[PDB]
Design a protein around this nucleic acid. Structure first.
Ligand code: ADP
Lengths: 787, 753
DNA sequence: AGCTGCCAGGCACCAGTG
DNA sequence: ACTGGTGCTTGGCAGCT
């Protein structure tokens, strides 16, 4: 309706609309003195989201402007509300001085708070990573980049197909996801939280390289091993531009980037991560997962590292051997190291706020406290004989000098904010504790002026006091007020009292507030100056936090191994899995009855097992424990068995309609002889035998061509004939015994096909009427007479 | 501390500042329930406390409120709230009590707002389980010696009660007292002891939560098994009646049938959907109404909408908690009745005219509320400005006095301003100082000497003078007497309205049902439904039937299908692809039966249908679950049952599964004789019709064209003669060579039989 | 311990007097 | 153009009880 041309707007709205256009789709907090305000649809939304009153800002020429707002000092509680809902918010501040500005004071968006770029402790989860990610798709593949803005961890990868792209998204589970406007495979990302559509130009390869190299201080990206990963570079370039625009400061903690090559780790598809319940159970909870058993780390950063390891098993033999050695060597040390490591806390995220220059007084306080743990940690670790632990000990560093700085600079228990001062300890700066000496030391004066004037006037109600609004005063009761000296200058009247000012008290008032201002400005400048002193050491600090997190992980793994009775696995050259008395690491902890340990023997000659046995026999658990044991071995952990020898695993596949078949094909197209394939219940055709026929042909392809290590749980008794027909296939089964009426589930794996199929017995157990089980048994004997 | 001891299993909201606060386990729990920070301590903003009580009670938590020294002044329990803010408009909220004899079960539910009070005596566990699912109580009372804890243990709002709260003699005495009856014969529950024990407990608990008479609870009804189509939880969930498999409400039967215009209508329609009645007399009557009201829905619905949730408004009347906009909405509802009475006048239908009469008019009550209350009264009566001028002479007098006093002060402002020549001069008001004369700081030194200064502001001075305080008393005493008067006249409205509560409850009930029937009429017109007919023996004959939801939700053409079931053609074996077409065909059969049996029109060109005692589905250890559901069908289905089964036998060996499907089919066809759609992949089962009377084959087929396959949804006679797994494997990308081997294997496996 | 309402500091608005 | 009063969010807290 109203024509909103430039000249139709007040200078305020011209300024505002100009800043708002700079972020058309996200809420804009617009600083107006003591309030952050919103206008138009921002006001309406904010009013709905934050439960604040929708009001109006009058207009002489035009429509009234919808309006909402909150006091500047309350902004964090509200940012919490918004980012907790996936909402970005641009934060706009007053840069200019109102007193020296004819028009509206200069304003700027200084920061944009988005779900994947938060670094404030209030807004994060301690034991969970919170990543920003960018995704890109061209004609022949995907590019993908993640950034942990709190740690600087910057990763790049190029999933070759849709299936690995999906798996990658599920693993990294970004809180915010930037995607190019021309992204075609939307089914992969639509309905993820934190979606952000971006213009194609943010993905341009040349700017990506220019910007990254600028960020890293490099001439090219060769040394980062990403110089030839253009798909990935396009996503990384977009991600980095987003990070810079949201923070609008230097990001010195983002100092390198690393490519995630497929050969470096065990690739797990979407269904495997979920079926193994690694960090999430099948109902979306965190209870009864692999992490819930293994993660007894003591620092938040360690908890997160462990979870990353578990989702990303490494295939580097030397790394694994080194972690294994570390776990052995530290086992008798865990009790003493853990209480100390605990006191280090989340050094990694504190350092993020250091690099971002947003660190608050308690952040530095906690940084100090961590530094104070280092010598003790150094002392405990000197004794331990193993190279890797000494490597970590060196990397942990010591920062006695920085520790001393923080001990001299900041009081024992600082306030939350530096905004009001009382953060910089006395003795640190001669000028400061001398402004305080004024602003504060002369508060004795008020007390004595009171008794002096009270005795001099003889008015016993006389009190000296202070009021933010009216300033310092001498107060007399209304009853006595007619008796006051005539050079008492009335300052403030109340119902039952009069308040006055005299020249002496007025001078003190200017003295106090001038020097109070001095102290606080100078204190803020000293606090900022601590950033200048700490920052030069950022790189060694991050190394330290990294060392400390890895120590937390390895120490915890040593304690788990001991307490849960785990063994060190050994690595063989050829594909294979030899397990003696293996257990399911989660199920054995959950069950309140004994877990039946089981063997496994897989080799290039015995590479596929057809697993039979009843429903509830333990086929699924057996297949899962196999993959968990492999996974654990490949993060350097000890494993829940009496002994394990394991060859290399390139990838773990899981398959347990169009969807079954499409997943099956994916195995058939991508599995290799180094793959572990776990399969169940495949073969749901439309008739009696079409499904089973596909299962048979798919198995044959896995046994004869692909040659993957394959555990194939099935109830199709026809498939127990496979070993007869093709090389590399053998039968095993989960033992069960029938005692008259019932069926006993032994949970023990035995060579050979099951003696029989127990569909009828399991049906009976479920309660199917006995007359019907009886007629079914009669039908079964007919079918079995074909043999 | 000590106040928490009074109520141990109830969260304590502790009044402390501008907030309430919970500590320890209460802070722990509250934080994980309300997405709120845990410092142990947690806080709630006073302005939005009701927004939190609603969330906590929705999750089954009672909340105790400890105001100001201090004591528990308010308690809300999930099953006994009646405030609008705490309820959801279109969902019933029930209190239930559950009891187990060394004989059978006892169950009772109460809608505390409508007063709808139901009793039943489920005979076995499954039936009791079904009852819980259907009724989904927000709060559930149970005896301490309750044996079948597995029925209830997972539920929200569990309330463990002493066994003595479940005694027959005191339950009777209490129930009789409540109803003002000598015995319960007139309610048809006099000899339903187990039911009565449950109702006894429930009613005591509800009385205890309110500490008020509950006059709107004047009746109780027994639910007998032969009265409705029984559905177990799986069947209920599988039919996505009001809840879809996801847990939501989109793409459900209600989501398509429910375009009612009042919240009470929506809630009542939903009860109907979950309780199909077997009494054709009621159905015929509902059908006739839907037919007679077809042409009228257009004019009726805008009017019915204005009636609103008169049902929950009347609860607040009965509990004496009704607020002014509650009375104005009742007024508004009253103002619709003559128009509704006039529209329904010509409708030649005895059920419609019964509704018209039972709807009433209350012209005297309408007129009262028009004279008593202003057009749009404030939310609370607390601050007055509720009672309309002209209603009470005395009231008008106190307001006129208050008004002359305030006019004088307005004129005082003017007189004092002109007289002093200070253009900032104003008269104002606040609590601390009452009436005052304000002058800006810059002018305050020109204040006239008679001005007594009382309050300095940053940029203004405030003064009093005798004249100001004189008319202050005038304003305040009159305005005081007027406010006290409003409150009495307001209470008096409850006294004049309450005697008509019974009639008023019948009226909101009539109005609710009209919303439902009129809506079903519009539905039947808009979605091209037809009126089913009822036959005496089991049978289901459908001409061109469709699935009520699929046809609306999916923007593809829906393919309609016949069905012919009778005692001579009791079971259909259904082969061919199951890519949704078999399941849909089976579910639409159930849904059509359900709709017929709530009196709705149904989506077909013609439906004749016999009596149905129960509808079972087994569609969509998995095998262990499927067999457990199969078992329940085989133990409980009769020849009046509709049994729908998909592909049992999956999840075990070919031969065990076939043997089980075969034996199950035989038992259904020959022993039970239920009307059964038996969907299967077993081609071997298509041999049943030769060996067995009353069984026949039908199948779905597909068509292969272009670079795809079109899965037809047309049900045709005979067994399927193709399988499609290989065609699917190929579309899905399974390598050509692999499918070729599968083809050879397939022929080899099939040709043996 | 309340409960009421001023104030915070931006900018625009408006009515009077140039 | 000046002058000097008004208004608008929410949270802290003085100034009354
Ligand atoms: N090795 C074992 N020892 C003891 N109990 C087991 C073992 N393996 C499985 N179970 C238990 O038996 C149940 C059936 O196991 P599952 O693997 O689901 O059976 P299947 O997949 O063969 O039907 C599981 O709930 C599990 O708790």
């Amino acid at each position: 309706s109203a024509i909103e041309n430039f000249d139709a707007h007040t200078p305020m709205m011209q300024q505002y609309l100009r800043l708002k256009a700079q972020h058309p789709e996200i809420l804009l907090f617009y600083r107006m003195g003591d309030f952050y305000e919103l206008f138009y649809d921002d006001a309406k939304r904010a009013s709905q989201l934050l439960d604040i009153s929708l009001t109006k800002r009058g207009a002489s020429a035009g429509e009234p402007i919808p309006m909402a707002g909150i006091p500047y000092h309350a902004v964090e509680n509200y940012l919490a509300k918004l980012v907790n809902q996936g909402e970005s918010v641009a934060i706009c501040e007053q840069i200019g001085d109102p007193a020296t500005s004819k028009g509206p004071v200069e304003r700027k968006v200084v920061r944009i708070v988005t779900p994947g770029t938060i670094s404030d402790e209030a807004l994060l989860q301690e034991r969970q990573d919170n990543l920003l990610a960018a995704i890109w798709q061209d004609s022949k593949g995907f590019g993908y980049a993640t950034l942990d803005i709190s740690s600087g961890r910057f990763r790049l990868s190029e999933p070759a197909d849709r299936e690995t792209m999906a798996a990658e998204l599920q693993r990294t589970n970004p809180a915010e996801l930037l995607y190019a406007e021309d992204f075609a495979e939307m089914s992969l990302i639509e309905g993820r939280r934190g979606l952000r559509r971006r213009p194609l130009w943010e993905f341009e390869i040349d700017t990506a390289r220019q910007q990254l190299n600028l960020q890293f201080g490099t001439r090219d990206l060769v040394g980062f091993g990403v110089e030839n990963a253009p798909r990935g570079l396009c996503a990384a370039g977009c991600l980095l531009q987003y990070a810079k625009d949201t923070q609008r400061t230097t990001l010195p903690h983002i100092r390198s980037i690393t490519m995630e090559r497929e050969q470096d780790s065990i690739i797990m598809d979407a269904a495997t991560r979920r079926n193994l319940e690694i960090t999430q159970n099948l109902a979306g909870g965190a209870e009864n997962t692999l992490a819930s058993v293994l993660d007894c780390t003591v620092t938040p950063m360690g908890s997160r590292m462990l979870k990353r390891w578990l989702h990303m098993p490494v295939r580097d033999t030397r790394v694994l051997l080194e972690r294994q050695q570390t776990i052995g060597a530290l086992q008798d040390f865990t009790a003493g190291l853990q209480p100390v490591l605990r006191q280090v806390g989340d050094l990694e995220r504190i350092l993020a706020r250091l690099a971002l220059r947003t660190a608050r007084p308690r952040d530095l306080a906690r940084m100090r406290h961590a530094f104070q743990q280092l010598p003790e940690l150094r002392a405990q670790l000197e004794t331990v004989d193993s190279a890797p632990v000494q490597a970590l000990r060196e990397k942990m560093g010591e920062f006695a000098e920085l520790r001393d700085l923080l001990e001299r600079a900041i009081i024992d228990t600082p306030p939350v904010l530096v905004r009001d001062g009382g953060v910089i300890a006395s003795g640190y700066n001669e000028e400061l504790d001398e402004w305080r000496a004024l602003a504060d030391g002369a508060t004795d004066y008020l007390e004595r002026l009171e008794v002096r004037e009270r005795e001099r006037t003889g008015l016993d109600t006389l009190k000296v006091g202070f009021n933010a609004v009216h300033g310092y005063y001498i107060q007399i009761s209304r009853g006595q007020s007619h008796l006051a000296p005539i050079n008492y200058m009335r300052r403030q009247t109340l119902k039952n009292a009069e308040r006055y000012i005299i020249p002496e008290l007025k001078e003190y008032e200017d003295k106090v507030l001038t020097s109070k201002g001095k102290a606080l400005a100078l204190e803020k400048q000293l606090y900022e100056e601590l950033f200048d002193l700490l920052l030069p050491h950022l790189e060694a600090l991050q190394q330290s936090a990294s060392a400390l997190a890895e120590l937390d992980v390895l120490v915890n793994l040593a304690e788990r191994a001991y307490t849960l009775n785990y063994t060190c696995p050994t690595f063989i050259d050829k594909p294979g899995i030899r397990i003696t008395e293996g257990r399911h690491p989660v199920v054995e902890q959950v069950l309140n009855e004994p877990f039946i340990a089981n063997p496994l023997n897989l080799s290039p000659q015995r590479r596929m097992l057809i697993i039979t046995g009843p429903n509830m026999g333990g086929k699924s658990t057996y297949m899962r424990q196999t993959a968990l044991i492999a996974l654990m071995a490949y993060i350097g952990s000890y494993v829940p068995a009496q002994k394990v020898e394991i060859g290399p695993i390139d990838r773990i596949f899981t398959r347990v309609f169009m969807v079954e078949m499409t997943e099956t094909a994916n195995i058939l197209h991508n599995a290799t002889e180094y793959s572990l394939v776990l399969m169940n219940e495949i073969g749901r055709g439309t008739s009696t035998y079409d499904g089973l026929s596909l299962a048979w042909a798919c198995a044959e392809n896995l046994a004869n061509k692909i040659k993957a290590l394959t555990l194939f749980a099935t109830h199709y008794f026809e498939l127990t004939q496979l070993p007869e027909k093709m090389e590399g296939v053998a039968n095993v089964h989960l033992d069960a015994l029938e005692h008259g009426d019932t069926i006993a589930f032994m949970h023990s794996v035995q060579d050979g096909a099951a003696s029989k199929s127990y569909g009828l017995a399991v049906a009976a157990l479920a309660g199917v009427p006995k007359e019907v089980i009886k007629r079914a048994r009669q039908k079964l004997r007919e079918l079995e007479s074909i043999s």
